Amino acid sequence: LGPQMEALGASDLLLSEQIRVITEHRYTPDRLQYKEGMKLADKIAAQEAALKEELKVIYGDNVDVKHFQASPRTPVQQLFDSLKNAAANKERAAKEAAAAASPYLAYAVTKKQEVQADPSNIPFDEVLYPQLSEELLELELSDIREDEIALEKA
Amino acid sequence: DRVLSLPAVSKNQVLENVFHTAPKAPVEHLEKMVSANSKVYDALNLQSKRVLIWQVKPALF
Amino acid sequence: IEAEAASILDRHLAKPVAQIRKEQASAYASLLKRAETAKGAKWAEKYLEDVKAVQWFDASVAEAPASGPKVAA
Amino acid sequence: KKQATENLMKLLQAYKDIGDAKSEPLLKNHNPRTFEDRDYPVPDFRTQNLKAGDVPKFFDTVISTRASAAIASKDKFWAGRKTEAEAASAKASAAFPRVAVPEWKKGKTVSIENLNTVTDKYAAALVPKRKLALPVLPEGVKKAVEDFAASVGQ
Amino acid sequence: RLLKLWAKRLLVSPELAIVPLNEFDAQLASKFEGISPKYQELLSAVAQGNK
Numbered sequence: 001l002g003p004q005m006e007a008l009g010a011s012d013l014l015l016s017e018q019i020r021v022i023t024e025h026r027y028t029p030d031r032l033q034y035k036e037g038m039k040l041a042d043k044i045a046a047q048e049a050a051l052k053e054e055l056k057v058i059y060g061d062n063v064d065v066k067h068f069q070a071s072p073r074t075p076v077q078q079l080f081d082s083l084k085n086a087a088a089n090k091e092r093a094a095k096e097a098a099a100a101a102s103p104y105l106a107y108a109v110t111k112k113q114e115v116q117a118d119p120s121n122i123p124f125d126e127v128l129y130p131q132l133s134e135e136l137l138e139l140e141l142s143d144i145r146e147d148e149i150a151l152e153k154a
Numbered sequence: 155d156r157v158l159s160l161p162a163v164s165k166n167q168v169l170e171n172v173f174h175t176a177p178k179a180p181v182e183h184l185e186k187m188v189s190a191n192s193k194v195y196d197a198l199n200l201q202s203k204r205v206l207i208w209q210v211k212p213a214l215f
Numbered sequence: 216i217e218a219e220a221a222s223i224l225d226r227h228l229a230k231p232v233a234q235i236r237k238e239q240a241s242a243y244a245s246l247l248k249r250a251e252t253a254k255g256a257k258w259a260e261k262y263l264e265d266v267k268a269v270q271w272f273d274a275s276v277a278e279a280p281a282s283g284p285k286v287a288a
Numbered sequence: 289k290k291q292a293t294e295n296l297m298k299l300l301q302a303y304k305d306i307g308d309a310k311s312e313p314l315l316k317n318h319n320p321r322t323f324e325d326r327d328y329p330v331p332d333f334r335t336q337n338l339k340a341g342d343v344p345k346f347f348d349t350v351i352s353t354r355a356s357a358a359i360a361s362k363d364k365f366w367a368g369r370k371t372e373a374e375a376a377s378a379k380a381s382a383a384f385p386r387v388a389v390p391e392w393k394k395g396k397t398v399s400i401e402n403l404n405t406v407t408d409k410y411a412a413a414l415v416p417k418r419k420l421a422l423p424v425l426p427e428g429v430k431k432a433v434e435d436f437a438a439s440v441g442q
Numbered sequence: 443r444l445l446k447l448w449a450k451r452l453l454v455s456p457e458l459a460i461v462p463l464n465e466f467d468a469q470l471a472s473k474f475e476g477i478s479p480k481y482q483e484l485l486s487a488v489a490q491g492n493k
Contacts, residue, residue: 001448001463028464032348033157036164043169079422102202104195104400108188108407112181115414119424123180123416135315139168142321146161151443153156157347158330162354163320171362172318184410187389191403194390198398203277207397208284215286333472340478343470 014066016045058085075124082119089117298380302373317365324358457488 003021011018023037052065058081073081093113100106115121126133197206227235247266253259275284316322333346388409390398451458461469461481469478 001445004444026463028344028468031344031464032352033164036166040164040166040169043166043173075420075422079424083424102192102195104199104403104407105188105192107404108184108192111404111407111411112184112188112414115411116181119422120419121415122419122422124420127420128416128418129314132314135313139172139315139319143165148443150156150160151447153159154447155330155333155347158350161321161324161326162351163324163358164355167355167359168319168321171320171359172315174318180414184407184414187387187410188407191390191406194392194398195400195403198392199400199403200281200397201400203280204273205276205280208272208276211395213283333470336472338470338472338476340471340476341468343472344467347467 009070015069016041016048079119086117298377302377320358320362323361457485460488
């Protein structure tokens with residue numbers, strides 16, 4: 001089994017770099033599912049750059065994106081991460097509104113920050129679209145159910 | 155031939171058909187219209203430092 | 216002149232704004248350099264002296280935009 | 289272009305009405321797994337005269353023919369969904385709100401109390417139309433609790 | 443369940459660990475006599491045990 005001795009989410013590598021060593025192990029490079037598996041590792045590495053990008057504002061540059069890919073932040077941890085930069089965000093907007101080029105732009109950096117510092121304005125896709133996040137779950141659960149039917153047949 | 159009982163459409167081909175277009179950000183409309191209305195403020199306000207009112211309707215001294 | 220300016224504008228409004236700023240900075244800088252190539256000519260001496268008087272107009276308005284340019288009175 | 293954008297917004301409304309009339313899931317028709325035929329007669333490799341290295345290339349072309357026939361069946365859904373919405377965007381309403389731009393009259397000037405209420409309309413769309421009421425503890429309550437905790441010596 | 447699947451297959455038939463999982467489908471053919479003999483004679487001798 002080799003790389004398949006540990007689950008898809010339960011390694012120490014990032015998920016996109018774990019898909020690459022499962023696919024290099026299950027298939028040879030001439031296969032269709034090797035090509036479709038290394039392409040999936042690009043969609044997941046695209047989601048890991050987009051998760052590093054929207055978490056480096058809080059946790060620094062050594063963000064440890066593996067911890068937040070495996071177990072994302074709860075809505076109450078998304079709250080308490082906005083509140084721990086809200087003093088440095090309201091003071092940063094006040095130093096741009098002082099040095100904005102015109103009093104139109106100075107109101108626009110304190111109206112955008114007045115909306116972006118409120119943690120009730122963080123868009124939760126599960127709150128906005130409840131039927132979508134229950135179908136984005138059943139995309140990932142039906143991919144596991146197809147692996148479980150293949151082992152009940154075996 | 156157990157692989158022929160698996161769904162032939164890949165996990166990749168789901169993710170490229172479900173997330174086909176990069177979605178439009180909510181703040182992308184703000185920061186594009188604000189930067190374009192900052193030029194409406196500049197040229198057309200009467201309190202801006204670069205107004206067009208003195209080079210369009212000149213003066214009478 | 217109304218029909219020339221309306222066709223000049225509608226051609227210019229069909230450009231993206233990044234093209235406009237460098238088409239105009241290329242035309243402004245090429246026309247400055249033609250007045251700086253000409254040394255000693257009276258017209259080029261007066262051309263660059265009016266560029267310094269436009270920049271006075273833009274700077275005198277920036278000091279008091281509800282007043283306009285400041286004239287000696 | 290203004291009429292093309294009103295046609296596209298009326299089409300995108302007609303897609304949303306005839307999808308919400310059928311009460312269908314959001315990700316169902318964009319998922320090409322849902323157009324895949326799992327009851328297909330599934331060709332036996334033992335009746336196709338394969339040599340030693342030829343069986344994985346047989347498996348790839350049975351899979352890629354069945355993935356292409358599910359994608360091309362998804363395209364035949366959406367090409368038929370389009371004409372169902374192109375024939376209802378024709379008999380439509382077209383009462384859309386206009387883009388908030390600052391009011392500029394003919395020889396007049398733009399006031400900053402109108403450039404700012406336009407920027408209020410941009411930042412009032414940054415709030416999500418359904419949100420979590422994530423509570424920030426104010427200083428008026430988080431000190432009155434710390435007062436009560438410091439009076440009992442904690 | 444995948445770890446339990448291969449647990450039974452390698453408790454009964456531990457020689458299956460000598461043909462790798464990616465190079466398995468490249469062995470088959472339509473007839474059993476057409477199966478590639480790369481691992482056939484090695485699997486028969488690993489199956490006979492450690493002596």
